[PDB]
Amino acid sequence: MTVTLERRESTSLWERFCSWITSTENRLYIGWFGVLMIPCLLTATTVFIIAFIAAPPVDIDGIREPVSGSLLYGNNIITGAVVPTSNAIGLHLYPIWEAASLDEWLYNGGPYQLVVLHFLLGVAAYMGREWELSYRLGMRPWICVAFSAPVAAATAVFLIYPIGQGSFSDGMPLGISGTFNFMLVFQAEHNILMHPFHMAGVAGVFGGALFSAMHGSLVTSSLIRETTENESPNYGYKLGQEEETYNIVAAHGYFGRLIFQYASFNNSRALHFFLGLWPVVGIWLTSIGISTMAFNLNGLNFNQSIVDSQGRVINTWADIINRANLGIEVMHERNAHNFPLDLA
Amino acid sequence: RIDYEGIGYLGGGDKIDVNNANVRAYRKFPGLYPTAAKKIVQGGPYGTPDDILKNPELSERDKEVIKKYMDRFVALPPTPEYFTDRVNNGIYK
Amino acid sequence: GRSIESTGFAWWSGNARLINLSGKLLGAHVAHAGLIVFWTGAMTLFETSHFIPEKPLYEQGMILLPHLATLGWGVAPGGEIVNTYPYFATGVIHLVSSAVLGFGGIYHSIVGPDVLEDSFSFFGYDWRDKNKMTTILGIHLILLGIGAFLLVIKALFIGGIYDTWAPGGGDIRFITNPTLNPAIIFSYLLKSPFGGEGWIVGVNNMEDVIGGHIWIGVTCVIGGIWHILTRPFSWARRAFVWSGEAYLSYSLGALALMGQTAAEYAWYNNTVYPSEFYGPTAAEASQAQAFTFLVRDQRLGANIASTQGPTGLGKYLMRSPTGEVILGGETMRFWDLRAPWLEPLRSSNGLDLNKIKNDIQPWQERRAAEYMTHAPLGSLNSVGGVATEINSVNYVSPRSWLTTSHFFLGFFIFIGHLWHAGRARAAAAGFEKGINRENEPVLSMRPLD
Amino acid sequence: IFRFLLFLQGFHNWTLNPFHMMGVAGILGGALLCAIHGATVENTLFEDGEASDTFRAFQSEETYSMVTANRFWSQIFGVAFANKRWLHFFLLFVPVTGLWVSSIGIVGLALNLRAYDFVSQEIRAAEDPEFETFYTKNILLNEGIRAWMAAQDQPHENFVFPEEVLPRGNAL
Amino acid sequence: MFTLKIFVYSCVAFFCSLFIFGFLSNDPSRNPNR
Amino acid sequence: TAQDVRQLSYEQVKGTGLANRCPEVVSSKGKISLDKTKKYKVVDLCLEPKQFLVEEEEFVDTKLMTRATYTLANIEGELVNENGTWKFIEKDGMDYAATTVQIPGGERVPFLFSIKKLVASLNISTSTELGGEFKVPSYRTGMFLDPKGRGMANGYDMAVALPALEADGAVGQEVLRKENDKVFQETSGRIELAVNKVDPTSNEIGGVFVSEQLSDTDMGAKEPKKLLLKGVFYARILPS
Amino acid sequence: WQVIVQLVFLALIITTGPVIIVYLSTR
Amino acid sequence: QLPETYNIFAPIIDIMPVIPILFLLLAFVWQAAVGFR
Ligand code: CLA
Ligand code: CLA
Ligand code: CLA
Ligand code: CLA
Ligand SMILES: CCCCCCCCCCCCCCCC(=O)OC[C@H](COP(=O)(O)OC[C@@H](O)CO)OC(=O)CCCCCCCCCCCCCCC
Ligand SMILES: CC1=C(/C=C/C(C)=C/C=C/C(C)=C/C=C/C=C(C)/C=C/C=C(C)/C=C/C2=C(C)CCCC2(C)C)C(C)(C)CCC1
Ligand SMILES: CC1=C(/C=C/C(C)=C/C=C/C(C)=C/C=C/C=C(C)/C=C/C=C(C)/C=C/C2=C(C)CCCC2(C)C)C(C)(C)CCC1
Ligand SMILES: CC1=C(/C=C/C(C)=C\C=C/C(C)=C/C=C/C=C(C)/C=C/C=C(C)/C=C/C2=C(C)CCCC2(C)C)C(C)(C)CCC1
Ligand code: OEX
Ligand SMILES: [Ca+2]
Ligand SMILES: [Cl-]
Ligand SMILES: [Fe+3]
């Protein structure tokens, strides 16, 4: 009697089912988390494809001005999108069976809500699934944490921000141009560039790419001669071999002479931990930034912070970026606002 | 429309088109905002500026101030485009 | 053991050295509680010290005082903070208690025994002892129930609680008839979290709040007794991982969920979080703007029920998708708002147009102006307003601080839950330190293709 | 730098440029590769010690199981690496390529040779006032940016835009 | 529309039940060290 | 049902859909007196469509796209006997509603269900009938902008995305003139109510309405379509 | 003159930590 | 504000809530003093 109860239950039908579900012999692993994931992602995918190709225009801002997002309605790959649900609906659950017809549903942006909810569910289940297979194969279980960062980002832009703003119409559009729109408006109303968490995110992705290129170049540089000339050096490695394929000492030495001796890593485990940690933390912080700005704790405001002796404002770059922000603000959703302050 | 002849009488000029201009325009002449302007808009439109004074529910104060700025008024033909927004024309600051 | 050689953990993961040391672990917990109560007291005294009599709480960056005011201490009808002394009292009490808990913490951490299983048998435990764990769980559950009943007692008998829905404006009231009807309470529990529903965040009267705490008190007490006097069934014993880290992970998941729930309470609810103290919600402020300019323009002679906006929708008044008469513009998304300054104008089919035309009161206009001018929007350096606003108003709504902070906390706490749950599984099965070079599972598996 | 960014958005529609999109692909892909490689190696480690601190337990022998990793990602994602050399080259290649491509784009913008518009949608929208995409919405956004900031960002030009000519929507 | 609701409810209840009761079937024992 | 609605609370109605329904009158007997000397006023006028027909080149049935946001209510008017004939002159209230239907083929037909400036002659018993003409303003107003920033009272005055088109003398952007010259087009649908229920004790009338009307033109860019609304109405008679 | 009091109190607390550590470091 | 009595104790209270942070930092000091960290 310790921690795990090591015991079985004798070739029962339900036990056979549990065995097949949790089987590590399946080409694609289908854990319990997969019992959630597969149907959700399939529904989401089907509705997404069909809508991206043939869905009628959607009244996104509830002002009876439908926006066209599908290919068969004059869009291309870059401009096509699944338009977010109507602002008249807000955060109300709008399933197909709550509409009078599929046509109404399409008009108010039901597809977006459906796809977003199903996708978030299925992706959470995807995270859980990564853990699950790690456990079934006797691995360490922290890949799903790493993947928890992107899940957090998706959850931020598809769920939390609509919650803070009171409408799924503020959720990120499922499309390229729509994404850009989301970004611009977000900058106008939260000044995300001046938010330290977004700066942390940029550090995460720039730094991530940097360390990717760095590690890659270092290991590629110190590959051990196992191949002939003009032949692919990749052939000099075989899957499953125990011998290391590159000179780690030579790489550490190079890096040591590039900057200084104590700037380099000696422990590969430490190095790869760092490689995993930097971008994941960055993205974590940016996701938090998107959600907390979803509750209007915006980026740093230095508008007219510098004054002269007489009391006149001396502009800085923050004032210029504020000018651009103003442009986006006054220009976005031209027919949606009736009152001078944009509080929603 | 692309072209409108009576644009100058909408607030940015010296005279006010009583039939089309927004209440804000009447802030140009002391005494008219908000009460006199309100009654003026609510009583429009008018064939001639003087018809403003023919409006019931106008106080003697209203009529006084209005006479003064009677020399300041014009009655262009009412166009619904501006007529509909005589109180709130979507302009703030 | 307090080294890498003696424990296996490094100085960072230093705290993992306390997993099987009951004494020092207890010391850590007690000292930590000491820190919590410390902060409570110190910050309360800080807020009392910085408070200014003739300003609203939400203009002064207060998060603790609004709680006490909500409970009904030092409040006049309308939400006026008159007596700031009970706040001082609670702050002092907490602080001194922090001295006590601090002493106990340092004692059990450094001075006392490392293992409480030797010298004692009641305060000693093995993580793998299910009965003992369910006993402790039961005790603390009973404690929580007692706390819920403390709130209930405070609201039913001792002065009462601040009711923003009180017939005559916000005022402290003794809840005479709490809601004990299961249909209603558990109607909250089994309700959608989406718009117009709000799950448990949609509670809008103190009868249901206090009654809910009666139910949760009874439930916690009965459950505590249940776990103290029983042992976990077979299925639970088979389904769960029984170790300290696992329990930690469970509590982490729970606290993440709770963090999110609290953030949502702070952001949408204005009953348990009176707008007089915490400030208006986003919804409330947007609706307040629409209301404000509806009043202004109606006073300028516009028939608002007939005023056509640029889109063709009502400029001031339109309909919700289910027919209710609502305020126009973007705030159409916020038509689920319920506020004591607006409900006087509410009818069966939504907003009553007649009451809008005739019965709008000056205090309502003042409320709308105040709230639309104190919307929960502001920068990180507390510059009030939208992102493009200039430096003049020093303001960030308490709702924003609370909600954002607790989202941050709930989020990272969830991360911790994943981490410790995973490591709990891996440590239980026995491969948390790496793959066995002599027992690699994959090598004993048939290839995928 | 933030100003330079919003400037290139408002004036060049830089987000719409395919080369920039390739750049974004390069960076985000790079960060993805960094994270996933780090996590994978850290979670396929061999037990080469007794301490929970697996860092201390680290030779020509691989410190992590390539086969187990391959199995895992093959059953999770459908496809996995099998060649360490190809892997490390790949996470060299992705970000570097990103940077180069975006550079092509920027040269383009040096000559104002932009990917600013989709003529088809501009013509359609010109003839049909009911036709709207997120592209056109962003075009409007660009116009706003340009006016307002134009006056403050280029002081030497002595741009004077009366408040009546500044493009904006209702109320705002 | 109601029949659609019934269908979707059936599916959701089905997969949710499989998930819950599935993860209750001694999942920690499902490891290579058992 | 007016008493029923009066007894109901907001929380009992909110979300049900009742808020968009017109009250009924459970009485088909009695008459409301009308002294041809005294002035009257119709109050709480509420029409509730049920049928939306759009004519195609006969009227065809459509699908409602904009849910329960189409009923007019609390509309206000003077009931004055002019030269012996009874006239109802609509004034205040919620006398308009933008609603969008969908005709076969998928084309969205938006329109402004209006009853503004209604003058309706009366021909009050269960045989009384109300018939008459009405103004329907432009679907969009002056400040509204198209996806390229063009409107009536504001916006660009040209196709600003095509500077090379607007660059030569004569023609010009004259082609796109039809889309650069936004027009406020007031039209007329024309209604025809028809009573059927009268409660003399509460002075309440209700019964059928027919309405005809004219519809959305995209600021003068496209030809409007005729729309057909078949419904019930409710009102009360209140002395001046 | 309140700022000096604040900074003195701050200095005393801040120093309080390390002093306890140093004191115990001698024994 | 504070009660008039304890008025004199205003500046000290201004530093009171910053103390838990110090404790966190203190941990590191302790560790650095030992030989770890
Ligand atoms: C209920 C709360 C709780 C408890 C009791 C524990 C307990 C434990 N955790 Mg844990 N953890 C938690 C929440 C919690 N965690 C959360 C929410 C996360 C997600 C962020 C984690 C993530 C985590 C990891 C990744 C690891 C642990 C580990 C451990 C074990 C050793 C911890 C240690 O030595 O700390 C040492 C403390 C420090 C090194 C201090 C770090 C301070 C952080 C990085 C900065 C935080 C910023 C802070 C808010 C303020 C900034 C400072 C500014 C004012 C200057 C121990 C059993 C370790 C383990 O598994 O061992 C078995 C381990 O590797 N934890
Ligand atoms: C639930 C937590 C919480 C909340 C909601 C607030 C809210 C508030 N506090 Mg308060 N406070 C708190 C905790 C909290 N505080 C604690 C714990 C202390 C003790 C130090 C204080 C001490 C304090 C003082 C002394 C004062 C306030 C004040 C205020 C007000 C203005 C806050 C401000 O400017 O923030 C500034 C916000 C920041 C600096 C952001 C912090 C950055 C975060 C922590 C992220 C960094 C961590 C990093 C990313 C983690 C790494 C992740 C890793 C795991 C990988 C506001 C009402 C002021 C006021 O007006 O009161 C009257 C004031 O004077 N507070
Ligand atoms: C019957 C036995 C018993 C009792 C009465 C308690 C009681 C308590 N334990 Mg505890 N504990 C026990 C057995 C018991 N424990 C055992 C066997 C273990 C394993 C060794 C622990 C391990 C343990 C830890 C690790 C911790 C506690 C803590 C606590 C306190 C919770 C404070 C709080 O916020 O709760 C919620 C509080 C309320 C809802 C308010 C009302 C609560 C009641 C009505 C009065 C509280 C007054 C005051 C705090 C203490 C008096 C309690 C006493 C008169 C019952 C509480 C005093 C925590 C603490 O901070 O201790 C100081 C903590 O961190 N306990
Ligand atoms: C303080 C919190 C607490 C904790 C940690 C536990 C812990 C435990 N209880 Mg327990 N219990 C508690 C309070 C608590 N209880 C209370 C207050 C009561 C009632 C008075 C009970 C009544 C109870 C019984 C009757 C039994 C347990 C059992 C158990 C054990 C198995 C747990 C399990 O499988 O859960 C899994 C639980 C579920 C799958 C139930 C699902 C909950 C339903 C669906 C309602 C939730 C829907 C809600 C509206 C939505 C929530 C939102 C959320 C999903 C985001 C475990 C040790 C069992 C055991 O082993 O015997 C001792 C057992 O038979 N408990
Ligand atoms: C239910 C489970 C659902 C799982 C999600 C589905 C995942 C689908 C993954 C498809 C990968 C295809 C790889 C082809 C190429 C291929 O077959 O490569 C196979 C290759 C195997 O590499 P080896 O190590 O065997 O190579 C050794 C030598 O051949 C090298 O020259 O895998 C990789 O290189 C790792 C990188 C794959 C990651 C690629 C990500 C691309 C994402 C898709 C981007 C476009 C999407 C457009 C959508 C409109
Ligand atoms: C374990 C450990 C740790 C921790 C520790 C802790 C956390 C502790 C805590 C402690 C505590 C938590 C303490 C507390 C204390 C408190 C006090 C000491 C209080 C006092 C009070 C007072 C003094 C008051 C006064 C007054 C009054 C009476 C009223 C009026 C005002 C005045 C101010 C005058 C560490 C990590 C570091 C490491 C080592 C080990
Ligand atoms: C006071 C108050 C109230 C009331 C409240 C209440 C009465 C509550 C209750 C609540 C509750 C009553 C809750 C519950 C919850 C539950 C949960 C949350 C569950 C969870 C579960 C879990 C976590 C599980 C998991 C799992 C699975 C699923 C698989 C297998 C394994 C395991 C077992 C792990 C009202 C609203 C009136 C008002 C406001 C205030
Ligand atoms: C209640 C009260 C009291 C008490 C107080 C206390 C309890 C205090 C404490 C205090 C404390 C508790 C302090 C502490 C501090 C700590 C520190 C000061 C630490 C650290 C710092 C630093 C700066 C560090 C740095 C570093 C290292 C060394 C390692 C890592 C790296 C680095 C560089 C970061 C008295 C008596 C006044 C009376 C009145 C009231
Ligand atoms: O929906 Mn999409 O964006 Ca958020 O802010 Mn208010 O609402 Mn509308 O304006 Mn700005
Ligand atoms: Ca008849
Ligand atoms: Cl608005
Ligand atoms: Fe590597």
From Swiss-Prot, chain B:
Main location: plastid
Its membrane topology: Peripheral membrane protein
Subcellular location: Plastid, Chloroplast thylakoid membrane
Post-translational modification (record): Predicted to be translocated into the thylakoid lumen by the Tat system. The position of the first transit peptide cleavage has not been experimentally proven.
Membrane-crossing residue ranges in chain numbering: none
A GO term from the CC aspect: photosystem II
UniProt keyword terms in alphabetical order: Chloroplast, Electron transport, Membrane, Photosynthesis, Photosystem II, Plastid, Thylakoid, Transit peptide, Transport
GO biological process: photosynthesis; photosystem II stabilization
Oligomer status and interactors: PSII is composed of 1 copy each of membrane proteins PsbA, PsbB, PsbC, PsbD, PsbE, PsbF, PsbH, PsbI, PsbJ, PsbK, PsbL, PsbM, PsbT, PsbY, PsbZ, Psb30/Ycf12, at least 3 peripheral proteins of the oxygen-evolving complex and a large number of cofactors. It forms dimeric complexes. The extrinsic subunits in red algae are PsbO (OEC33), PsbQ', cytochrome c-550 and PsbU.
Function as written in the Swiss-Prot or TrEMBL entry: One of the extrinsic, lumenal subunits of photosystem II (PSII). PSII is a light-driven water plastoquinone oxidoreductase, using light energy to abstract electrons from H(2)O, generating a proton gradient subsequently used for ATP formation. The extrinsic proteins stabilize the structure of photosystem II oxygen-evolving complex (OEC), the ion environment of oxygen evolution and protect the OEC against heat-induced inactivation.
Family indicated by similarity: Belongs to the PsbU family.
Gene that encodes it: psbU
From Swiss-Prot, chain C:
InterPro entries, A to Z: PS_antenna-like, PS_II_antenna-like_sf, PSII_PsbC, PSII_PsbC_sf
Cofactor comment: Binds multiple chlorophylls and provides some of the ligands for the Ca-4Mn-5O cluster of the oxygen-evolving complex. It may also provide a ligand for a Cl- that is required for oxygen evolution. PSII binds additional chlorophylls, carotenoids and specific lipids.
Membrane topology: Multi-pass membrane protein
Cellular localisation: Plastid, Chloroplast thylakoid membrane
Alphabetical GO biological process terms: photosynthetic electron transport in photosystem II
Alphabetical list of Pfam families matching this protein: PSII
Keyword Endoplasmic reticulum: no
Keyword annotations from UniProtKB, A to Z: Chlorophyll, Chloroplast, Chromophore, Manganese, Membrane, Metal-binding, Photosynthesis, Photosystem II, Plastid, Thylakoid, Transmembrane, Transmembrane helix
Sites where the protein binds [CaMn4O5] cluster: E343
Regions crossing the membrane: 45-69, 110-131, 154-176, 231-251, 267-288, 423-447
One Gene Ontology molecular-function label: chlorophyll binding
Major localisation: plastid
NCBIfam families in the cross-refs: psbC
Family: Belongs to the PsbB/PsbC family. PsbC subfamily.
Function, as annotated: One of the components of the core complex of photosystem II (PSII). It binds chlorophyll and helps catalyze the primary light-induced photochemical processes of PSII. PSII is a light-driven water:plastoquinone oxidoreductase, using light energy to abstract electrons from H(2)O, generating O(2) and a proton gradient subsequently used for ATP formation.
The protein, known as: Photosystem II CP43 reaction center protein
Source species: Cyanidium caldarium (Red alga)
UniProtKB/Swiss-Prot annotation, chain G:
Location(s), subcellular: Plastid, Chloroplast thylakoid membrane
GO cellular component: chloroplast thylakoid membrane; photosystem II
Entry keyword annotation includes Membrane: yes
Keyword tags: Chloroplast, Membrane, Photosynthesis, Photosystem II, Plastid, Thylakoid, Transmembrane, Transmembrane helix
Biological process, per Gene Ontology: photosynthesis
Keyword Nucleotide-binding part of the UniProt annotation: no
Entry's transmembrane regions: 3-23
Bilayer disposition of the protein: Single-pass membrane protein
Family assignment from sequence similarity: Belongs to the Psb30/Ycf12 family.
Record's function text: A core subunit of photosystem II (PSII), probably helps stabilize the reaction center.
Subunit comment: PSII is composed of 1 copy each of membrane proteins PsbA, PsbB, PsbC, PsbD, PsbE, PsbF, PsbH, PsbI, PsbJ, PsbK, PsbL, PsbM, PsbT, PsbY, PsbZ, Psb30/Ycf12, peripheral proteins of the oxygen-evolving complex and a large number of cofactors. It forms dimeric complexes.
Name recorded for this polypeptide: Photosystem II reaction center protein Psb30
Shown stretch of the complete protein: 4 to 30 of 35
UniProtKB/Swiss-Prot annotation, chain H:
Transmembrane segments: 8-28
Principal cellular location given in the protein's record: plastid
Keywords annotated in UniProt: Chloroplast, Membrane, Photosynthesis, Photosystem II, Plastid, Reaction center, Thylakoid, Transmembrane, Transmembrane helix
Entry's localization field: Plastid, Chloroplast thylakoid membrane
Topological category with respect to the lipid bilayer: Single-pass membrane protein
Keyword set includes Transmembrane: yes
SUPFAM superfamilies: Photosystem II reaction center protein K, PsbK (SSF161037)
GO biological process: photosynthesis
HAMAP family: PSII_PsbK (MF_00441)
Assembly information from the UniProt record: PSII is composed of 1 copy each of membrane proteins PsbA, PsbB, PsbC, PsbD, PsbE, PsbF, PsbH, PsbI, PsbJ, PsbK, PsbL, PsbM, PsbT, PsbY, PsbZ, Psb30/Ycf12, at least 3 peripheral proteins of the oxygen-evolving complex and a large number of cofactors. It forms dimeric complexes.
Function: One of the components of the core complex of photosystem II (PSII). PSII is a light-driven water:plastoquinone oxidoreductase that uses light energy to abstract electrons from H(2)O, generating O(2) and a proton gradient subsequently used for ATP formation. It consists of a core antenna complex that captures photons, and an electron transfer chain that converts photonic excitation into a charge separation.
Stored NCBIfam families: PRK02553.1 (NF002715)
Family (UniProt): Belongs to the PsbK family.
Name under which the protein is recorded: Photosystem II reaction center protein K
Native organism: Cyanidium caldarium (Red alga)
